[PDB]
């Protein structure tokens, strides 16, 4: 069985703005704060969709 | 067509929870407008 970073903190409540933060303690090299975005703009919930790789613009009586 | 009309979890997640008070309160107007237009309130108990 033979400084180091500590454990991250709990994600703070999502503020009115996108800014949500998480902090790590050096209790060393690295970052002490990480600020990410959060808004939960997707209210609708239908199902997990499957996506393609790439698409194109363009492929009875006519028009 | 009657494809879909979906809106949920907005009233429970963000209803009441400095400069972003506008950003917070604006979507409530549109949610109320959608609820009045769709005429669907029986989804909740």
List, in order, residues 6 or more apart from B15 with CB less than 8 Å away: B28
Closest by CA to A20, choosing from A9, A34, A31, is A34
**Separation between Cα atoms, residue A11 and residue A20, nearest integer Å:** 7
The structure was resolved to a resolution in Å of: 5.6
Q: Which of B6, B13, B21 sits opposite A44 (nearest CB)?
A: B6
Q: How far is CA A7 from the centre of its chain?
A: 20
Q: Which of A16, A40, A45 sits opposite B20 (nearest CB)?
A: A16
- Is the CB of A43 less than 8 angstroms away from the CB of B21? no
Tell me which DSSP letter residue A53 carries.
Answer: S
Q: Interior CA angle at B28 toward B27 and B33, to 5°?
A: 95
Phi and psi (nearest 5°) for B14?
Answer: -125, 90
Tell me which DSSP letter residue B43 carries.
Answer: T
Strands (E), A1-63: 20-23, 33-36
**Separation between Cα atoms, residue B13 and residue B20, nearest integer Å:** 17
The answer to whether A15 and B18 are in contact (CB under 8 A) is no
**Separation between Cα atoms, residue B31 and residue A5, nearest integer Å:** 44
Q: Is residue A51 within 8 angstroms of chain B, CB to CB?
A: no
Token look-up 């809106």 returns B7
């Amino acid at each position: 069985n033979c400084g180091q970073w500590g454990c991250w903190s709990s994600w703070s409540t999502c503020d009115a703005t996108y800014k949500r933060s998480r902090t790590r303690e050096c209790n060393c090299e690295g970052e002490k704060r990480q600020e990410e975005d959060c808004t939960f703009s997707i209210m609708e919930n239908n199902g997990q969709p499957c996506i393609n790789d790439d698409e194109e613009m363009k492929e009875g009586c006519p028009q | 067509e009657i494809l879909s009309a979906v809106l949920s979890q907005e009233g429970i997640n963000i209803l009441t929870h400095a400069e972003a008070e506008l950003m917070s309160v604006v979507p409530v107007f549109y949610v109320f407008h959608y609820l009045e237009t769709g005429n669907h309130w029986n989804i909740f108990h």
